[PDB]
Design an enzyme around this catalytic site. Structure first.
Site, PDB file in Angstrom:
ATOM      1  N   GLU A  58       3.537  -1.084   6.503  1.00 49.54           N
ATOM      2  CA  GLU A  58       3.295   0.194   5.831  1.00 49.54           C
ATOM      3  C   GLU A  58       4.462   1.192   6.005  1.00 49.54           C
ATOM      4  O   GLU A  58       5.293   1.034   6.898  1.00 49.54           O
ATOM      5  CB  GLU A  58       1.994   0.707   6.485  1.00 49.54           C
ATOM      6  CG  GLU A  58       1.396   2.038   5.998  1.00 49.54           C
ATOM      7  CD  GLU A  58       0.621   2.757   7.115  1.00 49.54           C
ATOM      8  OE1 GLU A  58       1.180   2.939   8.222  1.00 49.54           O
ATOM      9  OE2 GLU A  58      -0.543   3.131   6.861  1.00 49.54           O
ATOM     10  N   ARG A  59       4.530   2.243   5.181  1.00 48.23           N
ATOM     11  CA  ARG A  59       5.524   3.320   5.311  1.00 48.23           C
ATOM     12  C   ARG A  59       5.103   4.211   6.482  1.00 48.23           C
ATOM     13  O   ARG A  59       3.968   4.666   6.511  1.00 48.23           O
ATOM     14  CB  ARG A  59       5.569   4.164   4.026  1.00 48.23           C
ATOM     15  CG  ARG A  59       5.972   3.376   2.778  1.00 48.23           C
ATOM     16  CD  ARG A  59       5.920   4.239   1.507  1.00 48.23           C
ATOM     17  NE  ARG A  59       6.156   3.408   0.315  1.00 48.23           N
ATOM     18  CZ  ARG A  59       5.234   2.684  -0.295  1.00 48.23           C
ATOM     19  NH1 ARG A  59       3.976   2.755  -0.007  1.00 48.23           N
ATOM     20  NH2 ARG A  59       5.517   1.822  -1.218  1.00 48.23           N
ATOM     21  N   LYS A 109      -2.901   0.866  -4.711  1.00 50.02           N
ATOM     22  CA  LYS A 109      -3.576   0.185  -3.585  1.00 50.02           C
ATOM     23  C   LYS A 109      -3.929   1.134  -2.426  1.00 50.02           C
ATOM     24  O   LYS A 109      -5.091   1.192  -2.044  1.00 50.02           O
ATOM     25  CB  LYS A 109      -2.798  -1.035  -3.078  1.00 50.02           C
ATOM     26  CG  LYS A 109      -2.680  -2.138  -4.143  1.00 50.02           C
ATOM     27  CD  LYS A 109      -2.073  -3.446  -3.614  1.00 50.02           C
ATOM     28  CE  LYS A 109      -0.737  -3.297  -2.881  1.00 50.02           C
ATOM     29  NZ  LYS A 109       0.314  -2.638  -3.686  1.00 50.02           N
TER      30      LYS A 109
HETATM   31  N1  LIG Z   1      -5.701   7.567  -8.919  1.00 49.02           N
HETATM   32  C1  LIG Z   1      -4.471   8.070  -8.953  1.00 49.02           C
HETATM   33  N2  LIG Z   1      -4.295   9.334  -9.407  1.00 49.02           N
HETATM   34  C2  LIG Z   1      -3.054   9.836  -9.436  1.00 49.02           C
HETATM   35  N3  LIG Z   1      -1.906   9.268  -9.077  1.00 49.02           N
HETATM   36  C3  LIG Z   1      -2.116   8.018  -8.634  1.00 49.02           C
HETATM   37  C4  LIG Z   1      -3.325   7.365  -8.543  1.00 49.02           C
HETATM   38  N4  LIG Z   1      -3.141   6.084  -8.038  1.00 49.02           N
HETATM   39  C5  LIG Z   1      -1.847   5.988  -7.840  1.00 49.02           C
HETATM   40  N5  LIG Z   1      -1.174   7.134  -8.185  1.00 49.02           N
HETATM   41  C6  LIG Z   1       0.259   7.386  -8.086  1.00 49.02           C
HETATM   42  O1  LIG Z   1       0.847   6.292  -7.420  1.00 49.02           O
HETATM   43  C7  LIG Z   1       1.245   6.687  -6.086  1.00 49.02           C
HETATM   44  C8  LIG Z   1       0.148   6.340  -5.111  1.00 49.02           C
HETATM   45  O2  LIG Z   1      -0.339   5.006  -5.386  1.00 49.02           O
HETATM   46  P1  LIG Z   1      -0.195   3.915  -4.224  1.00 49.02           P
HETATM   47  O3  LIG Z   1      -1.524   3.692  -3.584  1.00 49.02           O
HETATM   48  O4  LIG Z   1       0.958   4.277  -3.350  1.00 49.02           O
HETATM   49  O5  LIG Z   1       0.196   2.617  -5.075  1.00 49.02           O
HETATM   50  P2  LIG Z   1       0.543   1.127  -4.611  1.00 49.02           P
HETATM   51  O6  LIG Z   1      -0.114   1.125  -3.152  1.00 49.02           O
HETATM   52  O7  LIG Z   1      -0.199   0.166  -5.478  1.00 49.02           O
HETATM   53  O8  LIG Z   1       2.023   1.006  -4.470  1.00 49.02           O
HETATM   54  C9  LIG Z   1       1.569   8.177  -6.216  1.00 49.02           C
HETATM   55  O9  LIG Z   1       2.925   8.370  -6.598  1.00 49.02           O
HETATM   56  C10 LIG Z   1       0.585   8.653  -7.292  1.00 49.02           C
HETATM   57  O10 LIG Z   1       1.138   9.641  -8.133  1.00 49.02           O
HETATM   58 MG   LIG Z   2       0.768   1.569  -0.973  1.00 51.01          MG
END
Ligand SMILES: Nc1ncnc2c1ncn2[C@@H]1O[C@H](COP(=O)(O)OP(=O)(O)O)[C@@H](O)[C@H]1O
Ligand SMILES: [Mg+2]
Lengths: 177, 66, 456, 109
Positions: free
Chosen positions: C179-180, C153
């Site tokens: 958010e973090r 996301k």
């Molecule tokens: N397009 C992408 N390419 C590489 N890693 C990704 C990608 N999307 C997510 N990730 C992995 O997931 C994390 C970032 O996604 P994030 O946006 O934080 O997910 P969510 O918000 O759905 O929890 C990182 O640990 C990364 O390695």
């Molecule tokens: Mg996130």
């Protein structure tokens, strides 16, 4: 729950008793005095302590009222204290009068005129209000300078308004709609 | 009301308590209810006899849950 | 007049005022001495109001005097908010001193009337193959990034911000809700180092803050976007997680004296969501284009919160944990994602046929997958054997390396125009690239690259 | 001192004692007319304590007198317990006579 819900049993008990023993006026004074004593800041603080037993709190209140409570009233006070309801005495005092008023066939009206007050005016309406309500009326007139011209009559949940503010309100919603 | 009823009240000898002190009302499952700690702040530490200490968590209207 | 605190329980505080001076619903109150703000949520009766603290209560005591401000939370609005970081109360949370405001608005407001809504289908290009194909965004439309924990996301939103906000000529509001704090710092330094911080207003309410802060941060950011929309401008509104607004209401609902509903949610879930979502819209004065990230509890799309959110959005992008678990990103689900702009009368028949063609191939392969597990591949008919190959390739060709993900991928980021997105998928569906190994389409931007990766 | 059974609900019994003689948590109490043992679980306020009966409550009534023993349930320990059968209160249930105990220990530690 509503203080009224919690005070309904106690008040009906006081009234059925006062009526069957012809004491409807003595208990009014006793309940008004008990309600009064309990509201004082020193008595309020005393009644909220964990050190005193129910009988000790009950006794302390009969001693302050003294003659104001007849044998029966003092026992009623012991019943209220035993059940831990000494915070409801003002509410218990209020609802007793309402049962009594319906019995005596009377109402305490609360008239509010704009800028005029006359002995003839109070009776002029107490006849119609009595005729309408089918009860004796104890008017309690007062002053409401807020009004341009007129009077607002409150009795129970009924509110007969003949104030020009009321005609202003009507004319205003009519003109903006 | 009546001056007589006004009196007797100054002869009741109604005690008083500091705003930084209170008394235990009930003791159950590690929860203690206390009366009178008017100056207690949420999360503040309460001192009991024996060196036992508590932490105020419920500052309700007429009782403190520690 | 003045009030006294009578009951503190967690984040909820009761304040008693004279029966002739009871503050209004949503009115802001201030504690004497302590620096704390309370918003009236309910009028219990007898001069008492129930309120939620916009700060900590560790320093609060019973009997502290509270002051009525006569109004709801008033935050600064307009040009002075650009290039600044602010809290829920509108105070600056950056060391750049005070903000030169020329006006303050109240965070609570009515939604635009039915006669004020405006309709537009201008197509907005994102640069991502899966989205540009099955989820075409539109200018002034509402987008939602649905997904569980750890599926992309934030990353996807950052890529969009980069492919749209940076080029966008108008202003922008970024709201970090629950958010973090580390993501907020990385994004601030990113907007500052990219020289784009000058056209972005930043409002932050992270997970370390009291429930009341996380419950009103969304109304603060939206109030700033509404001031710009009402000036006749085109605005971008990015919300990090709108679920934290619903959750803050669940955390406080039971202490507010409300009986719980299904899945332990507040009984006001659909109205509290509608009151916020109806203000995020494009009226006849200006256009707000908005992207919201929507958390899905335990990956279950049927949970009351995600389920109530779909009806408020124009474009719904769905991220799948099963695709992410195979090393595929972006992990968008083409068979679960949808968009209103996906209509031949809005885009064109060539685009629409390519999108439905991809979906048809992937839907049929979802049933052959189990057939291949039991028995074997040999037992399939030739048409099924041929289809299984194209489906596995299309799934891989949907993967695109992003510049914001270079830290994780290790490879350079790529940008694909919708033309290349349509061309490549059409060719694969035609079977032109049936001569290429399956591994050649993984993270290869345009189809051309895939032809080159097959040689390595 | 001596308290009065004020409430009975299944295995749980509430007993009221004078404010200066309230039993401590886990203190053992004995009902005067049946010798049934009760263990204090919590103090409710106003001199009232809540307890669990260490036996059947059938036949008990409100107003019965209760004696506080000044200690928790104490059971016999040591060599005298070997080859013997005992109940929850440390009484012998094997018909082999009394236990030759030298000391008793409380069951809460
Ligand atoms: N397009 C992408 N390419 C590489 N890693 C990704 C990608 N999307 C997510 N990730 C992995 O997931 C994390 C970032 O996604 P994030 O946006 O934080 O997910 P969510 O918000 O759905 O929890 C990182 O640990 C990364 O390695
Ligand atoms: Mg996130």
């Amino acid at each position: 729950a509503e203080l009224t819900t919690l005070a309904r049993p106690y008040a009906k008990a006081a009234f059925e008793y006062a009526q069957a023993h012809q004491q409807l006026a003595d208990w009014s004074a006793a309940l008004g005095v008990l309600a009064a004593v309990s509201q004082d800041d020193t008595v309020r603080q005393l009644l909220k302590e964990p050190q005193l037993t129910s009988s000790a709190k009950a006794q302390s209140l009969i001693d302050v009222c003294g003659d104001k409570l007849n044998a029966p009233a003092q026992n009623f006070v012991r019943t209220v204290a035993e059940n831990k309801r000494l915070e409801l005495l003002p509410t218990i005092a209020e609802m007793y009068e309402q049962l009594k008023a319906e019995q005596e066939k009377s109402v305490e009206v609360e008239v509010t005129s704009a800028f005029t007050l006359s002995k003839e005016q109070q009776d002029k309406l107490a006849k119609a209000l009595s005729a309408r309500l089918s009860r004796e009326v104890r008017l309690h007139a007062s002053e409401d300078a807020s009004l341009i011209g007129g009077v607002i009559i409150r009795a129970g949940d009924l509110v007969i308004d003949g104030s020009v503010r009321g005609k202003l309100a009507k004319l205003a919603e009519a003109l903006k709609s | 009301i009546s001056e007589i009823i006004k009196g007797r009240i100054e002869k009741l000898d109604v005690a008083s308590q500091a705003r930084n002190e209170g008394t235990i009302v009930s003791v159950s499952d590690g929860i203690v209810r206390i009366y009178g700690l008017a100056d207690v702040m949420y999360g503040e530490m309460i001192e009991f006899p024996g060196g036992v200490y508590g932490m105020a968590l419920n500052l309700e209207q007429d009782s403190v849950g520690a | 007049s003045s009030g006294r605190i009578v009951q503190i329980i967690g984040a909820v505080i009761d304040v008693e005022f004279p029966r002739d001076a009871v503050p209004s619903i949503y009115e802001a109150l201030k504690v004497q001495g302590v620096e704390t703000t309370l918003e009236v949520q309910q009028q219990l009766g007898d001069g008492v109001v129930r309120s939620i603290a916009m700060g900590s209560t560790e320093g609060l005591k019973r009997g502290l005097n509270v002051d009525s401000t006569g109004a709801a939370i008033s935050v600064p609005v307009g040009k002075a908010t650009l290039g600044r970081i602010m809290d829920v109360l509108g105070n600056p949370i950056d060391e750049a001193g005070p903000i030169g405001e020329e006006e303050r608005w109240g965070i609570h407001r009515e939604a635009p009337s039915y006669a004020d809504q405006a309709g537009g289908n201008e197509l907005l290009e994102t640069g991502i193959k899966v989205i540009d194909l099955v989820c075409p965004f539109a200018k002034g439309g509402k987008v939602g990034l649905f997904g569980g924990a750890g599926v992309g996301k934030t990353v996807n939103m950052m890529e969009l911000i980069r492919n749209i906000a940076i080029e966008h000529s108008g202003y922008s509001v970024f709201a970090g809700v629950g958010e973090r704090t580390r993501e907020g710092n990385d994004f601030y330094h990113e907007m500052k180092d990219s020289n784009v911080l000058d056209k972005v207003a930043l409002v932050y309410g992270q997970m370390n803050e009291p429930p009341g802060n996380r419950l009103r941060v969304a109304l603060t950011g939206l109030t700033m976007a509404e001031k710009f929309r009402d000036e006749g401008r085109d605005v971008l509104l990015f919300i990090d997680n709108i679920y934290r607004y619903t959750l803050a209401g669940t955390e406080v609902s039971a202490l507010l004296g409300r009986m719980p509903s299904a899945v332990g949610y507040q009984p006001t879930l659909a109205e509290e969501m509608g009151v916020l979502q109806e203000r995020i819209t494009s009226t006849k004065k200006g256009s707000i284009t908005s992207i919201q990230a929507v958390y899905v509890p335990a990956d279950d799309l049927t949970d009351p919160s995600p389920a109530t959110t779909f009806a408020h959005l124009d474009a719904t992008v769905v991220l799948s944990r099963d695709i992410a678990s195979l090393g595929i990103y972006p992990a968008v689900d083409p068979l679960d994602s949808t968009s209103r702009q996906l209509d031949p009368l809005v885009i064109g028949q060539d685009h629409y046929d390519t999108a439905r063609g991809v979906q048809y191939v992937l839907q049929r392969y979802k049933e052959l997958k189990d057939i291949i597990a039991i028995l074997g591949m040999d037992e399939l008919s030739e048409a099924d054997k041929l289809l299984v190959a194209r489906a596995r390739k299309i799934q891989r060709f949907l993967s695109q390396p992003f510049f914001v993900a270079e830290v994780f991928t290790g490879s350079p980021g790529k940008y694909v125009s919708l033309k290349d997105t349509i061309a490549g998928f059409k060719g694969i569906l035609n079977g032109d690239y049936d001569h290429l190994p399956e591994q050649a389409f993984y993270m290869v931007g345009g189809i051309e690259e895939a032809v080159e990766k097959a040689k390595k």
